[PDB]
Each structure stands twice: as C-alpha cells, then as structure tokens.
Amino acid sequence: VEYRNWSKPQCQITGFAPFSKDNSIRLSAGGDIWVTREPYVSCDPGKCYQFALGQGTTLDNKHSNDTVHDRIPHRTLLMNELGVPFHLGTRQVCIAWSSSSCHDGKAWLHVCITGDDKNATASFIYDGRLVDSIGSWSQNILRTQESECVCINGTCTVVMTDGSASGRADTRILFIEEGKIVHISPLSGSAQHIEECSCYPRYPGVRCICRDNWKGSNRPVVDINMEDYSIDSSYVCSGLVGDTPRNDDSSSNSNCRNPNNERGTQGVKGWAFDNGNDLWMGRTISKESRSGYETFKVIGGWSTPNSKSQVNRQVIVDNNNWSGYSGIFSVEGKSCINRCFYVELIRGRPQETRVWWTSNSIVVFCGTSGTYGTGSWPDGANINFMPI
Amino acid sequence: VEYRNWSKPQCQITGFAPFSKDNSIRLSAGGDIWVTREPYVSCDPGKCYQFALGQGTTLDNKHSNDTVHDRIPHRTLLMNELGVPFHLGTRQVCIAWSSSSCHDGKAWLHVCITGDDKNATASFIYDGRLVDSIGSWSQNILRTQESECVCINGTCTVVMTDGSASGRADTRILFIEEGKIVHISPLSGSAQHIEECSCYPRYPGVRCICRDNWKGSNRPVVDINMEDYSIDSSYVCSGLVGDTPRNDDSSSNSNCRNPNNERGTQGVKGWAFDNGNDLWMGRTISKESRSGYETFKVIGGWSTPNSKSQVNRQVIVDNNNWSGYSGIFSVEGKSCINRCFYVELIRGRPQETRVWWTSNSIVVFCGTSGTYGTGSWPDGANINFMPI
Amino acid sequence: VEYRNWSKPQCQITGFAPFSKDNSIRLSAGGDIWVTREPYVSCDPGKCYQFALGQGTTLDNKHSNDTVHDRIPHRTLLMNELGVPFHLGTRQVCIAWSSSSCHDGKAWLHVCITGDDKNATASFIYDGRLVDSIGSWSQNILRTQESECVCINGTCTVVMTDGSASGRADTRILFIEEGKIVHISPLSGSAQHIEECSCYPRYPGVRCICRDNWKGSNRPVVDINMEDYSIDSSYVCSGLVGDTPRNDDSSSNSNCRNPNNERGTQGVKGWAFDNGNDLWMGRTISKESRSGYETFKVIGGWSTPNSKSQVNRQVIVDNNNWSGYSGIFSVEGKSCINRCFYVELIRGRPQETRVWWTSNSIVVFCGTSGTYGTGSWPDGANINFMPI
Amino acid sequence: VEYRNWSKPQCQITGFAPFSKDNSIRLSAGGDIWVTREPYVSCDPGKCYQFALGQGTTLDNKHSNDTVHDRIPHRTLLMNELGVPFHLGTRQVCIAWSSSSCHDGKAWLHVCITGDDKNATASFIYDGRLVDSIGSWSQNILRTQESECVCINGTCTVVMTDGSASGRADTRILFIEEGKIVHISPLSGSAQHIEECSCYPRYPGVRCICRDNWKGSNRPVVDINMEDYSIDSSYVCSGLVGDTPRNDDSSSNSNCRNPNNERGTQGVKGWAFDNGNDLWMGRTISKESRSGYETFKVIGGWSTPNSKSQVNRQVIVDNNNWSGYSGIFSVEGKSCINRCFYVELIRGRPQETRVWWTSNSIVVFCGTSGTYGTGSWPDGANINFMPI
Ligand SMILES: *[C@@H]1O[C@H](CO)[C@@H](O[C@@H]2O[C@H](CO)[C@@H](O[C@@H]3O[C@H](CO)[C@@H](O)[C@H](O[C@H]4O[C@H](CO)[C@@H](O)[C@H](O)[C@@H]4O)[C@@H]3O)[C@H](O)[C@H]2NC(C)=O)[C@H](O)[C@H]1NC(C)=O
Ligand SMILES: *[C@@H]1O[C@H](CO)[C@@H](O[C@@H]2O[C@H](CO)[C@@H](O[C@@H]3O[C@H](CO)[C@@H](O)[C@H](O[C@H]4O[C@H](CO)[C@@H](O)[C@H](O)[C@@H]4O)[C@@H]3O)[C@H](O)[C@H]2NC(C)=O)[C@H](O)[C@H]1NC(C)=O
Ligand SMILES: *[C@@H]1O[C@H](CO)[C@@H](O[C@@H]2O[C@H](CO)[C@@H](O[C@@H]3O[C@H](CO)[C@@H](O)[C@H](O[C@H]4O[C@H](CO)[C@@H](O)[C@H](O)[C@@H]4O)[C@@H]3O)[C@H](O)[C@H]2NC(C)=O)[C@H](O)[C@H]1NC(C)=O
Ligand SMILES: *[C@@H]1O[C@H](CO)[C@@H](O[C@@H]2O[C@H](CO)[C@@H](O[C@@H]3O[C@H](CO)[C@@H](O)[C@H](O[C@H]4O[C@H](CO)[C@@H](O)[C@H](O)[C@@H]4O)[C@@H]3O)[C@H](O)[C@H]2NC(C)=O)[C@H](O)[C@H]1NC(C)=O
Ligand SMILES: *[C@@H]1O[C@H](CO)[C@@H](O[C@@H]2O[C@H](CO)[C@@H](O)[C@H](O)[C@H]2NC(C)=O)[C@H](O)[C@H]1NC(C)=O
Ligand SMILES: *[C@@H]1O[C@H](CO)[C@@H](O[C@@H]2O[C@H](CO)[C@@H](O)[C@H](O)[C@H]2NC(C)=O)[C@H](O)[C@H]1NC(C)=O
Ligand SMILES: *[C@@H]1O[C@H](CO)[C@@H](O[C@@H]2O[C@H](CO)[C@@H](O)[C@H](O)[C@H]2NC(C)=O)[C@H](O)[C@H]1NC(C)=O
Ligand SMILES: *[C@@H]1O[C@H](CO)[C@@H](O[C@@H]2O[C@H](CO)[C@@H](O)[C@H](O)[C@H]2NC(C)=O)[C@H](O)[C@H]1NC(C)=O
Ligand SMILES: [Ca+2]
Ligand SMILES: [Ca+2]
Ligand SMILES: [Ca+2]
Ligand SMILES: [Ca+2]
C-alpha cells in the first residue's frame, strides 16, 4: 500500500448527485442511536466512513437533556462506514469535542481535542496508536476543522485555531507524518479569522475554504504549500457569499482580500472549490438561519471579485427544513479527483423546543459529470414523534 | 479477481429447495427492525446478500405510520448478508426509492433512483464511489428493476423505464462499465410495456422477464445482446400467465408476441426462466391479489404459444398468507449456473388495517437437481401481536 | 487451504475444563435475544461457532408464546462465533427445524431440514450455496443430528433418520462432497433405533454416539467407514448408561449389543467417546428428568459389558438446575485431536410454567490434560425476573 | 507473522494524553449494555481491545440486582475493540471471574479462572482453543492479574495467587508457550503479598507493579527473568505510595524492601513504571476511598527510598468522581515502546445506593513526548437518571 498523492486532475462536474443519507433522527424515535453533532465524511482508498462528535449518550435517554452544549468530557469521535447509523456498536475512536480525520493511503490519522476550555490538549492518533500531542497555545478553546484533513505523499496537514471567537486569534497549520508533528506554520496572508476549514487536495498543494467568525460573511481561503510549508490566505471572490448570517444577494460583497464587514460576526462551517475561474459552492438557503441548503456554480466566482452570475443551482434541502454544518471530501476516481460534500441536518434545540436534546442526521452528495434532476432530502423526523 | 462471464451451462433442475428466511416482521414485534419493501437478492462470487428499500424508520416507531407510500426522500437501499435481519447495524448503501445491484466479479454496482417524481435522478455507484448519473428522460417516475442487474466480462446491463404506468412509456437498456454508462439502447421488439425486470445471465447474452402494467397479464420478455447492444422483446409463451391480476387458467392466453388484454392493467414484479422448450415460473396463487405463491414447470411453456400443461408444482406460500414481489438471481456452481428466487412477504396496509405500517419479510429458494417434499413458509407474524 | 483429515491421535485427557457460556436467558430479560433450542458447537480450523435452531422470534416478544413446539416453518439455523449471544445481528444460515453443520477445511457444510412432517426436505448448503437436496423417504419427520457432522479428506458424513419415534425407523448415512450427496448407506448392525447422533472423527473413520428413543436407555453406537461406506452399529458397553430416562445405577444394564429395555422409551441427545478400553461420557444427574449434568470416565466402559467402575467425575450443572441436550465436538491441536462438549440449558415450559416460552442457553467444556477443580455453571436466570 | 520481542527502548514521556473513553454507564441508561467490572486494555500488533468481566446480565435488567459480588458462575470475559461499548453483540471469550489476556504476535492467550472459591480452575486458551488448565493449589480463591500479561519471543508470563487475602499466600509465576504451561516459578524476594499485578515488557525481562492486600500501602514490585525463569521482588521506592487506602503524603513511607505497615490491609489494583531513577505512577486522589485519579512523576521515585519530590502531575478524574482499578499496557511504536494506562470508573454499589447494581466505564490515556493541558474525564452518568 502506497501513500496517496492526489496527483490527478479534478473531475469536470456539471453538478452533484445523491450519494448517502443516514436517517439518524427518524431512527432514534424507535431504537438506540447516538446523539451527535459536527459530522463529516472521509474515505480510505477503498470505502467511505462517516464521523461525528458523540455526546456520550443515546437520544432516548435522560442524558440527552441539554446536549446543545458544545464541549463536555464525554464527547468522543464516532466512526462507522458511510450509511451505517450511529448505533450502540459504533466505535468511539478517541476523546474529542473537536476533531479531524484523514487517511494517508496506509493508515488513518485522527486529530482529537478535549479537556478544559483554557487548557485543552490535541491528541494525534495514527494507525491505532497515540503518536503525538500538543497543548493549547492561546488558552482559549483550541479547535480544528471538523472535517477531513488531507495527506500528500505521507505528509498530512491540518488547520487549528486557538483564541477569540470574535476577534484576532492564533491560527496554525500543522504538518504531520505518521502521526508525528514535523512542522508548524503560522497563518499568513490577508484572512483575519479562520475556523473550521473545509480542505481538499489540489496537487501539489492543499486548499481550504473556512469560516470567518469575526468580520466576514465571505469565506476565507487558505493555501498550503506542502513542499516548503509556506502559507497564504485571502477570501473567496464570489459576491454570492457562503457564510450564515450574511446580507441578501443584492447587497452582499467580497473583494477577495478582506472580510466584507457584512453581518460578519458568527457563522457556520461551509465549503467551496475552484474550477478554473469558476467556483462551486454550497450555502444555507436562509441568509440568517441554518435553514435549507443549496449548491451552485458561480461564473468567475474564483477569479472575479464580486461576481454574482450563478448557474446549475440545486436544492439539497428545502428552506422549510433545518440544515447546519457542511463540508467537502475528495474521492479518487480512475482518472480524476472528484469532490463530494455532506450536509449536517440539525434537529432539536435551540430551534425546536418541544425536545430537550440537540442532534443531527446527514445527507451526502457527490460530484457528477452526468445529468440529474431535482429533489429535497431533509432530516425527515417528526418532532412531535420524538422522545423529549 | 476476474470479471464474471457466467459462461457455464444452466443447472438442470427438478424444482426448488428451501434456502433462506429472515422472519423480519415476527422479530419487529420484539426488537428494532427496519421497515422495508421491494427486497431482492444478489451474490458476489463468495456469498449472498439481501437488499431492500428502507422507509427511513424502524417498525416499532411512530414514523412507521403511513409507510404504504412508494416514494419519499428518506428511502435508502439496505444491504446485509443473506439471513441477517435488517437491524440498526444495517448499512444504507445509497438514497433510493427504486434500485438495482450486481457484482461484476470485482466490485458491487448499485443503481439508485431518488428525487421528485417528474425530475428524478439515477446515481451509479461502483466500488464504493459515485461514477455516473442520469436525469429523468420522460419526467414521469424514472424507475428500474428492483432486483439484481447482470454483468458479463466487466459490462453490466440494467433496464430502466420512464413514463406512464398505464400507457406507452420510454424504456431503455443501459450498459455500464465500472460505474460508467457506455451505451444506451432503446427498447425494441413487440413488448408494449416494461417494468421491474427480473434478469439473468444466459451466455453470451442476458434475458429478462418483466411486468407489463398496461395491457398484459402475460409477462414481457426482453433479450439483451451484450456484444452489439441490440435489444429484442416479446412475451412469455405459457398460457399459464404469471402476472397478478390475471384471468383464471381456463380463460388465460398468451400468443408469445402481444399483451393478452386480459386484466392487463396493474401487475406485480415476477420471474420465469427457460429450459429448452420448457418454462420454470412462479406466480401468486390468487389471481386477483398478492396472496400465496407457487412455482411450477410449464411443458412447452417457452416455445409453444398458449401451452397449459404444468408439472413439478410447489407451494412456497399457501393461499392463506400474503406474498408480494418476487425475483430471480443466479448462483455460479462448480460446473453450472443455478437459478434461485426470492419472494417478498408483505404485511400491513393496505390488506391489514389493524396496523398503520407496511413492511415485508422474505423467503428464498434455490434450484435443485435432487429431490424435495412439501411445505409452506409464510411471513408468520401475528398481526394482533404487532405494534400498530 | 487443505481438507481436514483429523489424522492425529486423540488427546489424553484427565477431565474437562470450562471453555464458554453464553448467558442467553439472563440477557433475554434485558435485551432482544433469539428464542432457541437444539444448540451445538462446531469449529473451522481457526475458531469455534455456536449454532442453534431459532424459533423465528425473540424472547421478549409475544411470538415467544408456545415455542415449546418442535417444528414450525419459521425455525432457522442460527450461527455466531462461540460466546456471541444470539442477538438481532445473528445470521440465519438456512430454514431448519433440524440440522447439522461441519467444516471440511475449505468451507462450511450445512444440512437443513424443514417443511411438512410427512414430506420434509433436506437442503445441503456448501460454501454459501445450495448444492443438493433430498426428500423424506419414510414420510415421517425426516431428522438429523442436531450437532456437528464430520469430514475426512473432503468427504463429510451425516446421519439421518425418517420414521417412527417409538418403533423401527429408517436410518441412513449420507456421504457428501462439496455439498453433493455421493453415496447413501443404510444403517447396519445391532442398533435398533437411532436419533440425534453425536459424532466425532476417529481416523480413518467416524464414530457416533446416539439416542435410542424406543427400547434402550443405553446409547447406540454407529461406526462409519469412510473408505468403503460400510456401516456397523451396537451399544455402549458401560453399565452406567447415558440416556434419560433410565434406571438408577444399581439396576441399569448394557450388553453392548441390544437395547436394554430399561425405561427405554423416550430419551435425550447425549454423547460419549472411547479411550482404549475406557469411556468418557456425560449425562443428566437425574435419572428421569433433564436436570443437572455430570461427566466421568468409566473404567472398561468401552470394552467391558456392564462395567460400572467410575472415576474422575465432574459436576457441570448441579441437580437443582435444568439441563437438556448435550453433544460433542472435536478441535485439532498441534499434535492431537481434543474432544469438547456443550450442554443445552433449557428454561421455560414444560418445566417452568410462570412463562409461556421455551428457550435455552449453553455452557461449553473442553478436554484437558492438565488439572482442575469443581463448580457448577447453570443457566442462572431467575424465572421470576423473566418476561412471561 | 513473528513473535513480539518488545526489544525497543522505552519512549521518553513528558506525561499522558487522552486516548479513549467508552461512556458505558451513560449509554446503559438508554440501551442494552453489559454490567461489568475489572476492565483492562491490551493490543495486538494492529489495534487495541478493551476487556472486562461481565456479570452475565445487562444493566437495565432485573438480573443486575446485587452485582456487587465478585464471583458467580455467570461471569465471562468480554472482549471488544477499544472504544466499542459492551453491547449485546460483544463476544464472551471464556468463563471467568478473574482473568488475564495478551497477544504474542501470532495469537491471543486468555487466562480464565472460574468455579468454587476453594477449588477453582484456570483455563488457558490460545488461538481460540483450550490448551491447558490448572487447579487451585491453596484452595482459597485462585486469582490472577485483571490486566494484560506479556509475551517475549513466544513465551508469555502471568502472575497468579492462591491463598489468604489478609495473610501470607502462595504466589506463582507461570510461563506459557502457545497456551501450554512450560514452567512455574514460586514467588521470590521481599514482597510479602502479591495480587493483581500490572506487568510490562522491559526487555529482556518483564516487570510488574502489584497490590499488597496485607501489610503495605506501598506497591510490590515483581521482576521476571524470561531467560532462566528466576524471580525477584521488592517494593516501589517512592514515599508517595500508590495503594488505597494509604497514609497522607506527609506520613507515608517506603524503604523499597518491606511493606510499610501503613494502612496496609486491603487495597486496589494500580500501576507504575520506571524511567532511569525516576518513576511514573497513578493513584486515586482520595487516600481512603476509590475516588478521583491522578498521575505524576516521582523524581528518584524508582531508585531513592522514600523520595517525595513530585512533578508533571495530571488530574485524570477529579476527586468529586468515583474511580477504581487501574492498570498498564504497552504499545509498540516505530522506534520505541510506549506506556499507556486505563482507569476503571465504578458506579453503583456500595457507594451509590439509589441503584442495586454495580458496574463501570473506563477512560484511557497514553504516554506522550509532546505537550498537553488539563481536564477531568469521569464516568459522567447521573445516578438519578439510571434504571435501579
Ligand atoms: C429538472 O432538473 C434539472 C437539473 O436540476 C433542472 O435544471 C436546472 O434548473 C435550474 C433552475 O433553473 C438551473 O439553475 C439556474 O441557472 C440560471 C442560469 O441559467 C440561474 O440564473 C439561476 O439562478 C437564479 O435563479 C435561482 C432560482 O432558480 C435563484 O435561486 C438564484 O438566486 C438566481 O436568481 C439558477 O442557478 C440549472 O442550470 C439547471 N440545470 C441544468 C443542468 O440544466 C430542471 O429545471 C428541472 N426541471 C424542472 C421542470 O424543474
Ligand atoms: C411430497 O412432495 C413431493 C414433491 O413436492 C410431491 O410430489 C409433487 O406433487 C405435485 C402435485 O401432484 C406434482 O405436481 C403436479 O404435476 C401434475 C402433472 O403430473 C400436474 O398436473 C399438477 O398440476 C395440476 O394440479 C395442481 C394441483 O396439484 C393444480 O394447481 C394445477 O393447476 C393443475 O391442475 C401438478 O403440477 C409434482 O410433479 C410432484 N413432484 C415430484 C417431483 O414428483 C408429493 O405429492 C408430496 N407428497 C405428499 C403426500 O404431500
Ligand atoms: C477439587 O477438584 C477436584 C477435581 O474436580 C476433585 O477431585 C475429584 O473428586 C471426585 C469425587 O471424589 C473424583 O471422582 C470420583 O472418583 C471415584 C473413584 O476414585 C469414584 O468412585 C466417584 O464416583 C462415585 O462417587 C460419586 C460421588 O462423588 C457418585 O456420584 C458416583 O455415582 C460414584 O458412586 C467419583 O467418580 C475425581 O476422581 C477427582 N478428580 C481428580 C482428578 O482427582 C476434588 O475432590 C475437589 N476437592 C474438593 C474438596 O472439592
Ligand atoms: C495547563 O496544563 C499544563 C499541563 O498539564 C499545566 O502544567 C502542569 O502543572 C502542574 C501543576 O502545577 C505541574 O505539576 C506540578 O509540578 C510541581 C513541580 O514543579 C510539583 O510541585 C506539583 O506537585 C505539588 O502540587 C500538587 C498540586 O498541583 C500537589 O497535588 C502535590 O502533592 C504537590 O504538593 C505538581 O506535580 C506540571 O509539572 C505542569 N506540567 C507541565 C508539563 O508544565 C498547567 O498548569 C495548566 N495551566 C492551567 C492554568 O491550567
Ligand atoms: C431537562 O432538564 C431541565 C433542567 O433540569 C428540566 O427543566 C427543568 O425542570 C424543573 C422541574 O420541573 C423546573 O423547575 C425548571 O425550571 C426546568 N428548567 C428549565 C431550564 O426550564 C427538564 O424537565 C428536563 N427535560 C426532561 C424531559 O427531563
Ligand atoms: C397514523 O396516522 C394517522 C393519520 O394521521 C392517524 O389517524 C388520524 O388520527 C387523527 C387524530 O385522532 C384523526 O383525527 C384522523 O381522523 C385520523 N386519520 C385517519 C385516516 O384515520 C393515526 O392515529 C396514526 N396511527 C397511530 C398508531 O399513531
Ligand atoms: C399465550 O397464549 C395462550 C393461548 O392463547 C394464552 O392463554 C390462554 O388465554 C385464554 C384467554 O384468557 C384462556 O381462555 C385460555 O385458557 C389460555 N390457554 C391456555 C392453554 O391456558 C396466554 O395468555 C398467552 N400468554 C401470554 C403471556 O400472552
Ligand atoms: C434487589 O434485590 C433486593 C434484595 O432481594 C430487593 O430488596 C428486597 O425487597 C424485599 C421485598 O420488598 C424486602 O422485603 C427486602 O427487605 C429487600 N431487601 C433488602 C436488603 O432491602 C430489591 O427490591 C431489589 N431491587 C429492585 C430494584 O428490584
Ligand atoms: Ca461570519
Ligand atoms: Ca399486468
Ligand atoms: Ca431411550
Ligand atoms: Ca494495601
């Protein structure tokens, strides 16, 4: 088994096709299913796996009460094959209220953060054993991507932040070989706040589309050079911005360089990727709440500041239903690298107060060069049918 | 591992022997089991797997209410080893309210259809990744076999229809290599309506026995040439017809060429296969409802129009019990290719209204050249013992 | 992978040591566990599996009512790794209300009987596919071993009976190669009634200790010659007889040749094996009911008619607790063949009427050349804690 | 596959990082989970497994009542991949109320003790078959490590004791090759009472840190020579002693040679390991009860009698939360052997009398050469939310 290089051209895509759905919440109403949030997807050379941060409890369980909270010692990283719901036989891979995972072609790497808010620790698990760890450097919620990291030629990269959620923070990019941290580069460039990066291989380098939780409703971009460890950053050009909250389409802006200062505070994990001058992206349909989900291509969305010409829109989740986090993952095909994405479908608190828990299911789509129709694939659970 | 060729003679059979039963409904009264319908069986070179379309819920679950409906966004293709009930550890292979699966000798292909009725999308998944997709071509419920597709020398074939359920439709035959559509041939021949084909390898080609939902209670036949992609079609000769509804044996007819216009509208997925001039087939015992199941050989049933001389009858499910869909699958033996079949055993609505759900279990038989006795292997659940 | 030959001397044992226990009934009171009976154990070259005949239902399930009955269409053969309880993820290997399984060194053989009492069918499944089948020859409950069959050099042998439970019956020995019946020999010798044989490899042949349900409380012996298919039979010499019911130790007899006509009617599956002139055997402690279980060595028990000198007794289940069926299995060690046995621990009806179901757990012991102490390992469930 | 030699230097560590947590009790409140105690962790060359002694029942189950008791016939050794909770699909590896497991590089060895207090039997299972067994030698609760044994070059060593819990007993060290006992050495040296050793490879030998239940609150040390089977023993030098109960830090003593006679009676399983003259160890935070858990390094703690200079302390479980047993396990890295430990988190009786059961979850940490922060990772279950 050889290290992955991802050295194939990116697949030409016309849009995305349905790939997977786990129906977690619907199942939780009649079965023992983990309470989760912050899910993602990543694949080894053979097959795909779904991940999520458990809350150390199932849903029909009094411990599900008040699981809206982000960080407790009982959160662990869950790992199943894609499409296998998080049942009681699910393996907890490590202790984590923040995590990232990727396969280098030989074995799995897991980056897992847990512990006190002011003094967290990140554990690096490779091939089933703990190889390294690092402590918080800003004493303010060390946190990472909540989606797959990416490895090229045996070196994996992952983006971590420590510091304010609403002000300048300390972002660093780690380079890891077989679980061992070999280099750390400070964030550099014009991005002013970085969280929860959705990264993908763009041989010879790596590209990440992130969340600015401070001043921008446009998404920061981070470029990682795997040859000399240099870092660059900026913002997605598209005038159709990908964060939530954000201004409506007629009054939103991006100049590619700075945060737009348009409803910039707060945000949601999301993704996008470049194709020449064009940009493929997803976003919530609602501009102020984590509701609905849509994807489209923006003409000149990568190269032209403020471009708002859109095409090939697809509704993934209609605006009558809740969404949440979303992220990218890459799949090596026979001749090219395909891009896929997942959408987190959050149910319960704070939006739905009949119940006392917070959880999610997922829906997953993959890039296609073929054709496709329309639909809507929401969580699908009836809140009135749920254990409270 | 090499591609399958299925280039062996068909096993000479004297009838069928008991092979498997999953007892799904009985187990649902005391455990968490998926609500399903439209099951089928397919085998890789090593072992058999049962498939079914989930309803995104377990049975003892308020979400099981009103699952009689055919198409919702939450339906997914379930896949287990044959004989493992669909418990919560079951993998959802893809999003689908219509599907087909087959193994080409190296990897699994799954064809999955989901989305809006008027604008559905079919996804083609091969070796665990999305390789292709196609959109609806007649904007009227794109739909496929609900049983195994078949592959010869790395090329898999699958029958898809789009259009009217009770009128002329648009049926196409797809040829797929490693998930990629390489050719599409329109239906051709004298079959006037084609749905839910049960196909089997008949080297060098593929033969399908289908469901005519429009004018025929006789079953359409589709012949697929894998070498030049040419298609031919007709109807099964046997005057003992295999659809439901149908006329009784004394007044049923087939001329091998046209639909018989005998209680032709509506129908049920079924199967049959040729052996020289003779025909092996299954059918519901009841001529008007999906009740009971029987198999038998029709002498001259393949070659002689309107033949009604039957032999080697076996009751599979007695007429006091509900059946449903049925389909064929092929298993490669040491010297020959065996033919097996599964029967869907539908419980709940519309027939049993004490409960609000609709689900099924299955029973499976395989061709034998030995001897056998008699019996009846129904679902066996007591409707009064079920969660409503 | 090569065929098993079992061509090593038998291990010299001083008794038996604890090997496994599944705690099924205890777990059934707080989880979804199959209702079973007629368990057995068989190992492939790597690891052991437990088998049982399910009743198509879990215990905490209204369908468990009246599962005292031996034969319904919903009984299937269950197969798990030894020590894994029969939970909802258990694979149902085939339809069976009577069965036998064994591994020839390359793949598993399963012999499964189901259908009408007067016209049953036996299916032979090898390497996950149906290879052969045979119908009832006496039209009176075709039935087999309910424990492992044994294979030498690619040929497996299994003992089947069809006919009266309380009179002369028609017993046949089948020889099966890769699932294909290659020869059938009639029972021969002086054994007058044969049921439920516990067989073991005794290179170059196979030896079975069985149940006489008609005239003997002494156990019949069947000797199977794998080279020329010839059969011989007689009775265990030991004056300490292994069946239940039976006379007490001071008035029980055996002449090695004929049934003893001592409370000979009815019986229970049991086992024994020769070591030179001596005999290792197990039996219920009670002489009239399936209560308790003990093993011991009888000096001259194999060669000397009516020998009653016992040594190395071990209590497996104390007489205050229910037992049931028991059987042998053989495990190839580095230099020798070891013998092990399991005991079925039956709970519920007819003996315990607070509940309406009948089920079992198991305990398993293996021969040892080392030393050991004492104990008692019963089912352990509190009938008052059980779902009725 | 080759035998393990553990012939690499010990990893230089700065402390420990979070590795795993199973949340068993929290999950038991909403799911079917085994009642357990005496857990441990051990790894094959590829992955880690968690073990525990089941009580033959799940938690939400009337049979969970009064599971505070240490020894019943229904206790079995449970084995899952690390991070997989003990659900109903868990394999019971053997019958045991005391056990030890390890992998020699080729296969698993399991040492399982069960039976009467005064006449117990230890079974030795290697590669899935029983190879040896030994009976009680002092007729007073034969017992072993309750943590992993260790194997060097095909020979595994395990420490067993039989006799008084509060007086001189008979401790022996067994050397086992492929399940077969090849030598037995009596304990030797100055350690006066030995129980529940936590052993680790220290090439060319094996070192164990144990529990003195009679006269010492300082932990005994057992040194095992794998080449000539010679044994030596003593006590840990550190004046900061590791047992519970124990004196507080200002009046606790150890002279390296004798039990300290400081609250020596009773105790708890624990661990420690040497690095040059220094010592890494864990212990409960409370000095009289199994509450809280902490780790630290004692400068000169291995070589200097009564040393009390501590550094690199970490809280694992805060003193508001219950702990219990703990033990070491070793993981082979690319260049070095790392040391890890697990902590048993006991909930229920005798400490929490609202419920009638006794069970545990676990948390697991591994040695790191990196950095880390702080936290607390207790069981986390709310006793008021539990089935009683
Ligand atoms: C059957 O399914 C197909 C495939 O999904 C579908 O074709 C798609 O239709 C959409 C909607 O018209 C197209 O996307 C649009 O592209 C135009 C540019 O030509 C954009 O201007 C659109 O964006 C504007 O309008 C959106 C609302 O539709 C707004 O939300 C947005 O803010 C803009 O104002 C939009 O991106 C897409 O290109 C095609 N896809 C393909 C491959 O042709 C078809 O419509 C479906 N059939 C039916 C009858 O529903
Ligand atoms: C024990 O099991 C064996 C094997 O199953 C069984 O033998 C079978 O009996 C059936 C029923 O008689 C045979 O099938 C028949 O074949 C005749 C031609 O010879 C047909 O005419 C029959 O069809 C007519 O009758 C059917 C009702 O039985 C009608 O439904 C149908 O419409 C026709 O009117 C039927 O096909 C079959 O050939 C044998 N099988 C073999 C291999 O011999 C036997 O009867 C069983 N014994 C008992 C006592 O149950
Ligand atoms: C600790 O464990 C060991 C091993 O289990 C145990 O030693 C065994 O004791 C039994 C009982 O005495 C021995 O078996 C007996 O052998 C004598 C011949 O020497 C037989 O006569 C006995 O059978 C008669 O008595 C039985 C009641 O015990 C009756 O049930 C039976 O009908 C006969 O009348 C019996 O077979 C066995 O040989 C030893 N095993 C060994 C290897 O020594 C020991 O006793 C245990 N210690 C205690 C105090 O529990
Ligand atoms: C963030 O996390 C880091 C890493 O855990 C942490 O640094 C650690 O702090 C502890 C506690 O101060 C240090 O351990 C101490 O070492 C000194 C020797 O210098 C000992 O004297 C201490 O033992 C005494 O005090 C203990 C109470 O803390 C008593 O329980 C004990 O009986 C002794 O009286 C203790 O061992 C440790 O060395 C560092 N680790 C490293 C690598 O620096 C830091 O404090 C955390 N920061 C915050 C603000 O949470
Ligand atoms: C979830 O936990 C909350 C907090 O304990 C529960 O709500 C509280 O219930 C108490 C008692 O009725 C009230 O006095 C408090 O005012 C409530 N707190 C809040 C924040 O409203 C709630 O009952 C729990 N939910 C369930 C289903 O157990
Ligand atoms: C399943 O859903 C049906 C339809 O919603 C429920 O039946 C309805 O119940 C309401 C409330 O009593 C009535 O007003 C409607 O008239 C009912 N509809 C019909 C068609 O009867 C039914 O209660 C649900 N079943 C279960 C078991 O919850
Ligand atoms: C198991 O089934 C039996 C039979 O249906 C039930 O017992 C019967 O109950 C009816 C109605 O009360 C009585 O009239 C019969 O006399 C009973 N039959 C017998 C044989 O006694 C029984 O209730 C069921 N058990 C459970 C727990 O549901
Ligand atoms: C667990 O078992 C205990 C002991 O059997 C049960 O407590 C007993 O209950 C009986 C009946 O009420 C009393 O007479 C005894 O005095 C109790 N024993 C003690 C020592 O208190 C208890 O009910 C069981 N717990 C549960 C939840 O079923
Ligand atoms: Ca923002
Ligand atoms: Ca029709
Ligand atoms: Ca008898
Ligand atoms: Ca002590």
Residue numbers in the entry:
A (entry chain C), B (entry chain A), C (entry chain D), D (entry chain B): 82 to 469
Per the authors:
Laninamivir octanoate complex structures with p09N1 and p57N2 were solved at 1.6 Å and 2.2 Å, respectively, demonstrating that the laninamivir octanoate prodrug can also directly inhibit NA without further processing. Furthermore, we confirm the binding of the prodrug, laninamivir octanoate, to p57N2, with a similar binding mode to laninamivir. The complex structure of p57N2 with the laninamivir octanoate prodrug has a similar binding mode to laninamivir and zanamivir, however laninamivir octanoate in complex with p09N1 is completely different. Additionally, p57N2 Arg224 forms a unique hydrogen bond with the laninamivir octanoate 9-ester carbonyl, and p09N1 Asn294 and Ser247 form unique hydrogen bonds with the laninamivir octanoate 9-ester-O. However, the novel conformation of the laninamivir octanoate-p09N1 complex disrupts any hydrogen bonding with Glu276. ***The laninamivir octanoate 9-ester-carbonyl forms a hydrogen bond with N2 Arg224. The native His274 is also further away from Glu276 in our p57N2-laninamivir octanoate structure and does not hydrogen bond with it. In both structures, there is no observed electron density corresponding to the octanoyl carbon chain indicating that this part of the molecule is highly flexible and does not engage many stable hydrophobic interactions with p09N1 or p57N2. The disordered octanoyl carbon chain likely destabilizes the interactions between the NA active site and the laninamivir octanoate 8-OH and 9-ester, which is indicated by the lower electron density surrounding the 9-ester. Hence inhibition of p57N2 by laninamivir octanoate was much better than for p09N1. The overall lack of hydrogen bonds and instability in the p09N1-laninamivir octanoate structure relative to p57N2 provides the structural basis for higher laninamivir octanoate inhibition of p57N2 observed in our study and a previous report demonstrating better laninamivir octanoate inhibition of H2N2 and H3N2 viruses over H1N1 viruses.
